[PDB]
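Record type: ASSEMBLY
Status: queued
Input:
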Amino acid sequence: ALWEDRDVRFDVSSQQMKTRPGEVLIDCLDSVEDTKGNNGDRGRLLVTNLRIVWHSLALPRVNLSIGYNCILNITTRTANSKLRGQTEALYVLTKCNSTRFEFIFTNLVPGSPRLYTSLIAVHRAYETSKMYRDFKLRSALIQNKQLRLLPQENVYNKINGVWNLSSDQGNLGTFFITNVRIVWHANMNDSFNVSIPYLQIRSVKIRALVIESSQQSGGYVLGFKIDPVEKLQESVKEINSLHKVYSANPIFGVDYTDAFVAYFADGNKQQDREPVFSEELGLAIEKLKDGFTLQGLWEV
Amino acid sequence: SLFKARDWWSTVLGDKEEFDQGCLCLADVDNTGNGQDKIIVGSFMGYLRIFNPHPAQAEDLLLEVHLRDPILQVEVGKFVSGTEMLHLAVLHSRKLCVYSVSGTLGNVEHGNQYQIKLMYEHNLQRTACNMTYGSFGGVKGRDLICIQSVDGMLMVFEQESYAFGRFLPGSLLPGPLAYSSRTDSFITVSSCHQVESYKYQVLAFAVVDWTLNIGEQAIDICIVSFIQSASSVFVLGERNFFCLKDNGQIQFMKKLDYSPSCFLPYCSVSEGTINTLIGNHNNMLHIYQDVTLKWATQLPHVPVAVRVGCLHDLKGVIVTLSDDGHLQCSYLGTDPSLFQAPKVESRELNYDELDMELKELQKVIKNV
Amino acid sequence: MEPLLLAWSYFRRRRFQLCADLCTQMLEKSPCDQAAWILKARALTEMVYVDEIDVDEEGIAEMILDENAIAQVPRPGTSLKGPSPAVRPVTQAGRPITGFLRPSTQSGRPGTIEQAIKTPRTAYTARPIASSSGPFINLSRLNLAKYAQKPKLAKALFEYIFHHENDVKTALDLAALSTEHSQYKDWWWKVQIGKCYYRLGLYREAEKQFKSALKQQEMVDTFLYLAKVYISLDQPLTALNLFKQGLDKFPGEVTLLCGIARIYEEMNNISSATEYYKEVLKQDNTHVEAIACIGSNHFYTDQPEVALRFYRRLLQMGVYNCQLFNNLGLCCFYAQQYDMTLTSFERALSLAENEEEVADVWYNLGHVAVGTGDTNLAHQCFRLALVSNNQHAEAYNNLAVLEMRRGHVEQAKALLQTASSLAPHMYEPHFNFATISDKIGDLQRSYAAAKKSEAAFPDHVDTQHLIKQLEQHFA
Amino acid sequence: LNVPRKTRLYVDQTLREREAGTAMHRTFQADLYLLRLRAARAYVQALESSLSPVSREPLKLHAVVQGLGPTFKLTLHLQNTS
Amino acid sequence: MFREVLPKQGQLYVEDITTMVLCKPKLLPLKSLTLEKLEKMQQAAQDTIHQQ
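Status: finished
Output:
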């Protein structure tokens, strides 16, 4: 469903670069040349709400899309002294489904390098806010007896005595309904709580309050049971209404081809062999490559 | 990939929280008995988190409890008077708390809950700084706790209550404390560059068993004892790296050219030697055979309190925890990768726009 | 959480700003608290700390106006005071360029104060030569006789005075009172007094304390300190014996082997410095010094592929410089790996935090270009090297060679004159000027230039034939 | 003679060149094109700012600084080259 | 299936002519850690002086 902040795509279409409903553009910069691919071609860089995009600005087909849940390090490099003005450069390190890429972005015209700052800022806002768009078990949600609300979140329905049909004897627990996510704590050792976001929900039906996950948190079917079913169907219908009105415009809580092969961070390596034990060092070491030895790789 | 710390289950651990040494512990606090360890991390922001990682995923975090006062030096040892089952110790600045992580199961991967029970607590008069734990004297099946203080005093609890407490003679800034069992001695590094060992029964009677004037003050001291042949005591200063004998003199020393932050002499290989791994402030791990570098790796973050443990059927996984909040299990990268330009065919050199710009610039040149 | 605890934990994690700040608070709150006092002292003195071992500027006075070597004209091979200049670039009459600039490099010495002044400021040291090598606590207010009684305070206070304030006299006063308080039984105070002496100028009075500290307890620190002292008295063969003694104590120390190799390279017998750098490698294998040195030597003795391996090693260990990437470019091009050649020069030009580094990268790009042909690209690269560093003599020489290739003789003559004026120790501008002069005539200028060439590279061949022809024309 | 020796690195590098010569040729030509582009760019920028101490209209100037202390002697060596 | 034939004889110099020599490619020496720290501490003072 949502891939803009979860993958890293190359030669993306002119439509997938367009702002998703919940997405929103923040800052832009022209003439940002792309490097780590020596095409020597200019472009335009965009720091959106969920991902960073770069399109060639002359052949807008060739482009890059990097999600914020797939970046590890972002480094700004101020160099290239007096000969001209102090120009910056952006080094982004990315790891998607166990494959490490690195992209470099060179600001050609030294007259507008401010972009490289705001990105950093929003990236923090992307990581400090994951309870908005991700699924978590047993977190630190509950205060003394109440829920700790996110910034853009207020409770809708406050129901006591809502069971959980995934355990045996620690069930009876409160059920908080909010505009961003729905949570249930256990009211007895209140660290068995589940916080499901509307973004991860696929369909709320009955078989009993069955909630299915959207192929990202796996097929996690959650079952709850309440007092006589009047309030039950009431809660189900209001939950479906809130789900649809959210999916209309997502929130995301962010406050404020061979293309891949030319962007590997390792260098001609998209792999990680099976980590096996090492009797030489005593550490878990990556498997050695068909004849190589540790004391032969170490020396020069 | 060569000389990088390839990634295993990794995570970020809060909202601009802050950790230190002693935070990262790695043992069987669940008392399963299978060998697979479990990560435990407690910041002095308040949250105590326990994980059972599997090779990001939601069900990895066992629990994320929050205590009011900050947390210093979570430990895992037999801190209960009755049984021989591992219990988790949490040292707040003016508080001691032994817990018990009991995990009950449901009929689904995420129907299993985890309860921490306050086995007992201890009000701390002085302000605690750090602590050590061990079988003081020659006792077995018990793990007494010797906590330090920010003002020098060290107070010893015999696993149940306030056994005693003695002031360290002549210390201002409290350094790293450890306990050697092959000599039954509390070993510390005073502010005046003296690595000092005190016999336990000597302190219990209140003095110095021995001293050694190393060139600096130490960040950590780790007495390791999985070798019963020749005992040794490791002392990592802020400029050097000593391995001392049991009488008190340097067995050997390394003059590091970087700034260490953490070290851990883990399981050894050869006869008599001890493999060790140290973490720069330059984001690297170094793996010495007591003086001699055997391997080196580029870490992502500045390692604080590294550990090595068997996590989910993979022995010797290195678990690092930064002080900002990162955490990462990792395995060494041993894949020499060809240095060669990527044979990319899709990405071509756009000759049209480039030739336009080159014609413009060459026109300027040949015109002037 | 608590002030003192959080500040001390900031100190353990090497923050060094947060600790001083919480202590400044904690000191404003209480005028009587020495823990936070010495903690702020530690933080302040460690924000600026740099170990005294590898700080050997020696200035310009201690190069001429200070005589300490016993022997005035000792045997060639026992005093500090390979590839020929036709392959390896040079810095002085001899002394080929080295890898791994360290701030203790002297790389030759001037003869007179005038020569040392009228040369580039950074031609005998890694940094431009000098003439000689509110506030937290005011040094004139505290009675060092009372802080000396408390060693826990005295040690951090001395480190503060010595490494932060650089007050060697008050530091020595404190260290003397402290040593007399310890009845001369702690090697640390002896080493510190020896350092105070060594940077006051008194070498023998420092060697005494370093020897007396070695007698107390062998440490790598005191061994390196005595090595510095002995090198200052121009005694290499004493320093080597002391280093081998230290290695007898510490069987595989890397700093001792590296000091032995540094001494062997200062004496310029590379056939042993490579052996000792190889021992360092067998111990460390990430040592930047040994790797860089063996890599340079492998590149210049027409083995650029082994040098490319040795530099790809430093690339593998997270080193990210302008020097490293330009080196990788030179190696890749000369080892015939044309795919990773120019991208390394691009990363170099990106990483260059200067105007001389950019000029050197453009110079090397011009070398790549002239190896490719297309002399116009090399022309532009040499002119850009000149634009970025006006006092770049190699760019002048190469641009004059390309000019005379085109035909413009007067341009080449002027550029070679500029090159030979900037760097007299080089031999190529003199030889080329003499050659072009002799080609057109002017045998006086040809002689005055070929003789300076022979003065620069005295074992040349074409210079000898030129001088023979000239002296034959004079009769 | 002093004819040099070649190790395993050389034969592995020549094998890579013999098996992947086309990609090396193409990428080196692309890099050379980009290098000509950037060198022409910097040459034009220098001509604009007139920052070349060597630039019909023949001249050559370079400035030498001498002396420590608060007072430095700055001598411009200028030369007509025609 | 015909392979282009290459001459088996190269070009051989028959006289040594004095040609102007070029300077030689210059491997930029690396730095130590103390030197980098000293330069950065020297420039940080300049930066604070300019930033007051």
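Annotation: Chain B has one domain: 1-336.
Annotation: Residues 348 and 354 of chain B are 12 Å apart (CA to CA).
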